[PDB]
Paper text:
The first step of this pathway is carried out by a tyrosine aminotransferase (TAT) belonging to the fold type I aminotransferases within the pyridoxal phosphate (PLP)-dependent superfamily. We have solved the structure of L. infantum tyrosine aminotransferase (LiTAT) covalently bound to PLP, providing a structural basis for its enzymatic activity. The structure of each LiTAT subunit shows the typical fold type I of the aminotransferases, with each monomer having two domains. However, unlike other aminotransferases, Leishmania TAT is not able to transaminate dicarboxylic substrates and its preferred substrate is pyruvate.
The N-terminal domain was too disordered to be modelled in full-length LiTAT, but its deletion in LiTAT_truncated did not affect the overall structure of the protein. For chain A residues Ser40–Lys448 could be built, while for chain B only residues Ser40–Ile439 could be built. As in TcTAT, the N-terminal residues (Ser40–Ser47) of LiTAT_truncated are involved in interaction between subunits. In both subunits of LiTAT, PLP is covalently bound to Lys286 in a cavity located at the interface between the subunits, although these cavities are not adjacent in the dimer. Since the hydroxyl group of Tyr345 is oriented towards the internal aldimine, replacement by Phe378 in LiTAT may affect the reactivity of PLP with the amino donor and/or acceptor.
Numbering used by the authors:
A (entry chain B): 40 to 61, 73 to 362, 368 to 381, 394 to 403, 406 to 439
B (entry chain A): 40 to 61, 64 to 448
The structure:
Amino acid sequence: SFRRIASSKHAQRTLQPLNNLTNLRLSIGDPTVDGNLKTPDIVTEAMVDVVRSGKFNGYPPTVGADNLRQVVSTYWRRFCQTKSRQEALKWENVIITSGVSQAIVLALTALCNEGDNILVCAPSFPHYKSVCDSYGIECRYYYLDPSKSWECDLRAAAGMVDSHTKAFVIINPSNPCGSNFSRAHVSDIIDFCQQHQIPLISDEIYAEMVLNNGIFTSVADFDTNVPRLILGGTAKYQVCPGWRVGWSILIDPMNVAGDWAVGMERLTQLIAGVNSICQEAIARTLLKCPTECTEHIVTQLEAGAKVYARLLISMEAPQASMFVMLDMEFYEKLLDNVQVLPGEIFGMSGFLRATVSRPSAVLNEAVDRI
Amino acid sequence: SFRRIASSKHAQRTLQPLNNLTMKPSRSTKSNLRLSIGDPTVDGNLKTPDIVTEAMVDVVRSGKFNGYPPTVGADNLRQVVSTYWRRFCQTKSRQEALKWENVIITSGVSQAIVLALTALCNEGDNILVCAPSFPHYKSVCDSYGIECRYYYLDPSKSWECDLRAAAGMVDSHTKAFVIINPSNPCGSNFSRAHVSDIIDFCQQHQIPLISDEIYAEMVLNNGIFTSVADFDTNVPRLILGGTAKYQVCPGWRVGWSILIDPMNVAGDWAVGMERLTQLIAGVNSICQEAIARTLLKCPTECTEHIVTQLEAGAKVYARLLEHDIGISMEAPQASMFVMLKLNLSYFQDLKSDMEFYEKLLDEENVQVLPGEIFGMSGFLRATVSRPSAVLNEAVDRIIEFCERHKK
Ligand SMILES: [Cl-]
Ligand SMILES: [Cl-]
């Protein structure tokens, strides 16, 4: 015979509730489903050129190709309204990752040990909770106030901070809330992080996907010595999540977080980096994508916002991202044939996440069915 | 002011000795000749098949494969890989034991290694790993607080596993036996009989066998590759492989793992690996479809070209044996590397493989890798995949270098 082989504690406690939960589907967080949103043609053709050259099939540096890091550094400068802020973004502090999902893993596991906690918004993109449970880090939720435009309850969060608290995480613009934070509110967050002396992690992957001529405020656009780790990429706004490319950018002017940066660098060695074809294709086109491409998608999202309004169930209208928030029992009865998502999944019972990114013809039929 | 932010223990102990090596610039006027590089794309002499390249083109232009794949891999590629590995099995039953349900698509074999070990072991466990070895097993183990417990390969018995010594290393915390076959850095290609013995060893000790078979297509001299798949056994085996080396595209970051477990004693291991793919959420969707379209269509001819190039590189290293300069070596039967054994008693001022590496580089601007990096001092890893003109020139400098330091 042969002794049964069991798995590790690490594997056993690694759970993704969304995926575990798994016809008109308003539950899907992937902009490629219908084809109404499209990757820019120049990116598609840069990929064609790059793979046909045969010059980008070799090993990249595990931290990312130099030129893509440089380009990403240059690209994020546009979110900075000032020269000093812009100069504070250095390519040396850019890391290319296998999607933002990996950037989250690297950020959290280079920073925390088992037994630590981080403060994370609720409701939230579930990956932070999943990564935390996987590695024995506590995901300590602070709550977002839906009646104050889904702003962070900074009064409450203060009471959650202790000696094992290692970071403060925000998602802005937000999946699942569709929120877009004001400049003053982002300033408060930074001050909060200063008062409590913890780094700020800002998931800014929807940066290009603000609606209604809204203003996006990146944690980069401030004069502060508070270390900030910005996570972003092209997966959502260039409609190519399956390419598995994203990045993290550290802004640390007084250099208080250098070991974190080194730790993240060292940990890229484990899977040894990112698809070399996509890295070069994005390095060639990231700065050349015209406002019009981002402007077509934003208009397409504004349409979905209009369709959900007919239901008015209450809701805070979306200012950004691809979702609106409007609980488990309601979800189950709808399928028995429309698919929504319960906010339970995201850390806040009593809501439903619905997607804005599908065609009106699909949405209208589903909103009517609701 | 602001509290200094420090890193985790996991980060602090994560080290890759190869990268770290990257070395004093040479005080020489000769051209830099690098024999240290483990990337088949370096010179352009070896080539990704055109049919794979044009499948990538069709796939990306379609705009139908830019979405999220399943974290475990696209269904069609998993089915295709399963079908592909069947050719390494000589029988219907062995072929039937390969199931696409037990294939996982990974971000290179490097991720496959992470998933295999961290889904199996807890901190405080150990695994048996060959030395010398591709450094990633050691790097991942140390990163995760798993002990990399070396058993030694024998350069005089064709770089075979010393199984007798390995037996004394097994204890209650030993969780796996790792082999690399064909081998980086040794160039060895195991006989069927040795692979049979390795499996028997794993049966006696009741530990799973992990086999890095990424050089499966790159056997030389009409050799026979024996996959751990090609056996009638209930020993659980996890095979790591991919297209990175033999289709000359390591940078695309695609590889896979295949679990073969006929009595289903390792289902939890499989479920664990699957769960852990959720953390980076999978693999480049363009390449998975491109490879799904072409993996079964690539002609034998594309590979025999690469093999021919490697056999020629091997002949050039053989020239080192014609001079009495203290270099012995088992000619490579596979993979892309050779291990040069140093007779240190030949040299007046060369104490170690490391010192040999430094002085060679400083004096002749030829870069090899000391075997220390791979877990076995007293050797040098040299690459066979470069063009003959590069190798021939570099071997001349090595010969000259040895004669000069002798006595
Ligand atoms: Cl990782
Ligand atoms: Cl991973």
